[PDB]
Structures are given as structure tokens and as C-alpha cells.
């Protein structure tokens, strides 16, 4: 069946550093001569709302300690951009991979390298949900852990920097420009996220994977078009489906149109009746179209 | 809880592409030795493979071995069980501090899934009681390594991918050439035994549930280890190995292992429409160590 996996982490591990300001420690990402980290590393050890403009104005460069594998880098300057700091260091990372910065959209899959004290401990795949949170596995100190994707040509897309955990347990991050996904605050406030929607594009991909693994009991004989599904979706907690043309690869290899799968989703939403689909007892929005194509065909 | 893998960078630097004639798979380069599945020298044939004949007629110049497109000189080859040890003309300067370790059912480990000597994915898996794993491998994944990283940084190399069974289950060897479950590296049928639920992992899962405030399912009944183990063998579960390793979580929750053994018996047939941490049936994916590491970092 399908397994969530991560892309290999080697090229990203060499960019992880330990960033300390005063007593506070978290992780940063060292690319060229710049270390990016969450700005809340300079927050005071009080429990009130943080005034970041005052925190930044009173910042002292000598209070920073930035290190990679216990080797200390010299801090040259620091600027604040949204919810991140860009710490200029006197040494460029000789292991900087070919890379770009990319802002995720809901439904995008990516990889997390979970880090503590500047040392990677785990790697896993995740999906950005419609409420702009992820379900990671993080403990205290994971802030600044990077999320990434690796393109076919080897370019690393840096797309997520871990920021905070919500009361629900959901995880919030920024991109490398400092924009927080979902515009949550890097504050000790109570923040309740919107409810997540089922990612209809992923459920379609999952059903195509089921057809390709011989699992076909659930297949509706009839069809519903995109307009009818999207009307149903917004009344039943699903996203609108993108476009039928995106699935041309899987539609061609199975001979099943997206509209047949949309009809099947409407049936299966009410329940499976004790049966399962690839080990799942309800519809699965964990896997993207591209993940299904890669895991089935290597493309 | 999230199944995750330990970082792969130090193992990526050991993956090589191994080719014999037209056949390509992966190998693992440590020091001046590349280990790979011996079936790379199998003839293009539909018949059972005579490996002693294939080995005695092997010629070194039919091998090509490369790391990230850089080809290595091949100096000699020996056969050990279901693996070859290819001596190459230089040592891997990025060989990590490492040992070889043979897995036992119930051990978690990491797989670096590789094709043509290039890693494409990394994930955690459990060695099941039928000595197979549920990977996501497609053709060409043979030679993909399995590993664990010790706290001191030592890499344990524990799995080399060998074959896929008709069921889709995956079979590998250790680095001494012993195939887990003693499956054969042959085109024959081969059916693995029925998989058993890993009771040690299910107990850990139920403690994680308790620690997350999910306790609708908790039994006040107690079943002792001996009684549980007798029930387990008749109900598709492994024995529970021991109780004392759970004592930290038992103290935090106030719930004994024997209560969770009773709860497994209560929940074994299903949850009746409810869920535990989002699962609709008992989960044996997570070890005690994983639950303790992911919730407390220890
Ligand atoms: C300063 C500020 C913005 C209030 C803050 C304080 C602590 C952290 N958290 C650090 O772990 C951490 C480590 N170094 C610095 N912060 C944890 C975190 O989000 N707690 C609280 C944040 C707001 C109130 C509810 C929970 C954390 C992050 C990821 C996974 N699990 C725990 C994040 C932001
Ligand atoms: C020579 C021998 C022993 C018969 C053989 C042939 C092919 C392979 N398989 C290679 O993909 C592959 C790539 N390079 C060399 N073999 C695949 C594999 O197991 N097929 C068969 C093996 C026995 C008969 C039924 C299935 C494979 C697919 C997906 C994940 N894992 C392995 C393994 C062993």
C-alpha cells in the first residue's frame, strides 16, 4: 500500500545550527553567511505579551551564541523580518545546498527535519492542512526545525521554520520570509485554529492508489461533476477539487474518471460498513497525487 | 504520535549503484567493501538459480560500482550467504563509525529506500513476527539499507533489501548474508506466516493514549502476563515481553500493565465506532522507546 515517507535529510542536516540568546536555545538554518531562526529567541522570560519592536531595539549582539557541531560562528549583525531573525555570521556554510525559498499552500506535502539544540533527531513527511497547521511530532525546543522539499534536479526548497505549538497540539511555522502560515501570533496567547477540511485532491489520489492495488469494492458506478461535488464539499467539510486535468496520469492508467471517484467520496463519507481501503477504515487525505505517482511508478 | 526516521545523511554517503551485466541494484560501501544482494549475479532466466555455479563463473570485469556517478575499481568478490562482499580499490572516506546488528521481530529500524544507487526516501519500520517488513519499495530497491543510530552516533547496519513476496511483503538479509525468516533469494512462490500484533507496542500505544487524556476504553480488570500470553497465542497477538520497562508510564498514569493487558482483550475485536488517538483499531506501530522519546525526549 501507501507509506508516508520523507525525502533524504543529508543535505539539510548540514545546515542546522544551535542558536542561543541569553538563556533561550532553539535551532537555526545556516545558508551562505545567514542563519535564519524564529524571532521569539529574543523574547524576555516573562509571561506577558511580547513587544518585539522593543525586544529588537534593545537586543545585544554579544548575547547571541551560534554554533554548528560545537564550533562557534561569529555573529556580525541581525535583522528582523516578520517572525524570523536573519543573523549574519562571519563564516559561510561550505555545505550550503543548491536551494530556493518556497511558500507552501494548503495541501502541499513537505518534509520536516526535527531538531533539538542544533542537532537533527528525526525526519518525517507532513501535509500543510487547510487551517495552515501541521501535525508534527515535536517536543519543547523544536523551534527553528526546517521543513523542505527536494526537487528532481536536486534543488532544496526551504519552506517551513517551526515556530509554536497551539493548545490543540497542532504545530505552526513560518516561511523563510518570516510570514507565519495562517498568520498565528508568536505570542503566549490562546489561539484556536479553524477546523480542518478533508483535502479532496488527496482523497482522489488515495482512491486511485486503491484502484491500482486491486481494491475496488467501493467504486461508484455513476459520476458527479466538479460543480456538483464542490457544492457538496462545502456543505460536508471537504475542499473543492482542483481540476480533472491534474489527474490525467492516474485516470489514464486506471480508466476511471475523477467524476467517478467524486461520486464514490459522497458514498464513502457516510462510512465504509466495516470494510477497509488499503488498511484505512475511513477516507484518507494523507497522500498527494505526486506521492502516489512516485510511490507506484518512481516518476 | 508520528512514525519518523532517524536522519539519513551518514548512510546516504555509503549508498552505491552496483551493476553486473545488465542487472542493477544498490550496495552499501563501508571501508573498502561494498555489500549487496548476491542475486545481482543471477542469470536472466526463469529457472531456479544455482548460486554456486553463478559464483564460480562470475568474472570481475562484469561488475560496475559507482558512488554518485563516480566509478570504483573492483578488486575481488566473495559470497557470504545471500550477499556479496565486493572489494573496491579505495576506502569510503565517509564511512561512519558503525557495527552490524541482526534484528529480532519487534525491533524498529530505519529504511533508506534507494534506486540505482540514489536514495529517494527514508522511513521507520518494524520487523514483524513473520520476519517481513511493510515497505514502500518498487522494482530496483534491492540493496536498500536498514539502520539504527545509537545515542553515541554509532550506526547499526541491520537490513539489506532482498525480495518482494507475492503478498507485497518485503524480505531482507542482514550484512552477514542471513535472510530474515530464512526466505530464499529465488523466483519461487514463498508465502510468509500470519503476522501477529506486537503486544509490547500495543501496550505502549495505550499508555500514549492515557497520557493524551484518551481513556474511555480503560479496563479496571487485570490480566497477568501468563494469562495474557495464553490468550494472545489464540488471538493473533505476541506474548508481552515484560512489565517492568513500562514502570515510568505506569507511575505517571496510575495504570498497571495488567490493566492494559485486560484492555487489549476488551478492544481486540474493535472499538465500536470510537477511536483511540484517531485509530479505529489497536495500533502496534510504535515501540515503548518511541513513545517515551516522542513525548518526553528521553
Ligand atoms: C516565546 C513564545 C513565543 C511564547 C514561545 C515559548 C515556547 C515555545 N515552545 C518551545 O519549545 C521553545 C523552545 N525554545 C523556545 N521556545 C513550545 C511552545 O510552543 N510553547 C507554548 C507557546 C505559546 C503558549 C502555548 C505553548 C513548543 C514548540 C513546538 C513543540 N512543542 C512545544 C514557542 C514560542
Ligand atoms: C533474481 C531474483 C532473485 C529472482 C529477483 C528478481 C527481481 C527482484 N526485484 C527487483 O526489483 C530487482 C531489482 N534488481 C534486481 N532485482 C523485485 C522482486 O522481488 N521480484 C520478484 C522476486 C521473486 C519472484 C516474484 C517477485 C522487487 C520489487 C519491489 C521491491 N523489492 C524487490 C528481486 C530478486
From Swiss-Prot, chain A:
Chain ranges of the Peptidase C30 domain: 1-299
Domain of life: Viruses
Residue positions of the active site: 40 (for 3cl-pro activity), 143 (for 3cl-pro activity)
Its biological purpose: Responsible for the majority of cleavages as it cleaves the C-terminus of replicase polyprotein at 11 sites. Recognizes substrates containing the core sequence [ILMVF]-Q-|-[SGACN]. Inhibited by the substrate-analog Cbz-Val-Asn-Ser-Thr-Leu-Gln-CMK. Also contains an ADP-ribose-1''-phosphate (ADRP)-binding function.
Record protein name field: 3C-like proteinase
Native source organism of the sequence: Human coronavirus NL63
Record lineage: Viruses, Riboviria, Orthornavirae, Pisuviricota, Pisoniviricetes
Amino acid at each position: 500500500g501507501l507509506k508516508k515517507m520523507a525525502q533524504p535529510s543529508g543535505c539539510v542536516e548540514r545546515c542546522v545550527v544551535r542558536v542561543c540568546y541569553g538563556s533561550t536555545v532553539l535551532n537555526g538554518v545556516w545558508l551562505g553567511d545567514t542563519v535564519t531562526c524564529p524571532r521569539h529567541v529574543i523574547a524576555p522570560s516573562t509571561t506577558v505579551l511580547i513587544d518585539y519592536d522593543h525586544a529588537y531595539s534593545t537586543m545585544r549582539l554579544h548575547n547571541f551564541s551560534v554554533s554548528h557541531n560545537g564550533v562557534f560562528l561569529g555573529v556580525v549583525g541581525v535583522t528582523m523580518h516578520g517572525s524570523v531573525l536573519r543573523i549574519k555570521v562571519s563564516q559561510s556554510n561550505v555545505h550550503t545546498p543548491k536551494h530556493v525559498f518556497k511558500t507552501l499552500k494548503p495541501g502541499d506535502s513537505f518534509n520536516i527535519l526535527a531538531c533539538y539544540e542544533g542537532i537533527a533527531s528525526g525526519v518525517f513527511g507532513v501535509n500543510l492542512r487547510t487551517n495552515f497547521t501541521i501535525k508534527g511530532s515535536f517536543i519543547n525546543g523544536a523551534c527553528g526545525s526546517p521543513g523542505y522539499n527536494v526537487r528532481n534536479d536536486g534543488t532544496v526548497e526551504f519552506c517551513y521554520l517551526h515556530q509554536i505549538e497551539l493548545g490543540s497540539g497542532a504545530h505552526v511555522g513560518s516561511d523563510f520570509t518570516g510570514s507565519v502560515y495562517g498568520n498565528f501570533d508568536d505570542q503566549p496567547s490562546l489561539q484556536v485554529e479553524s477546523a480542518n477540511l478533508m483535502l479532496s485532491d488527496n482523497v482522489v489520489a488515495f482512491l486511485y492508489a486503491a484502484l491500482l492495488n486491486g481494491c475496488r469494492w467501493w467504486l461508484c458506478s455513476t459520476r458527479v461533476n466538479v460543480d456538483g461535488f464542490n457544492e457538496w464539499a462545502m456543505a460536508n467539510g471537504y475542499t473543492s477539487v482542483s481540476s480533472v486535468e491534474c489527474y490525467s496520469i492516474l485516470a489514464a492508467k486506471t480508466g476511471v474518471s475523477v467524476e467517478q471517484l467524486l461520486a464514490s467520496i459522497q458514498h464513502l463519507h457516510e462510512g465504509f460498513g466495516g470494510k477497509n481501503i488499503l488498511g484505512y477504515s475511513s477516507l484518507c487525505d494523507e497522500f498527494t497525487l505526486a506521492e502516489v505517482v512516485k510511490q507506484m511508478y518512481g516518476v
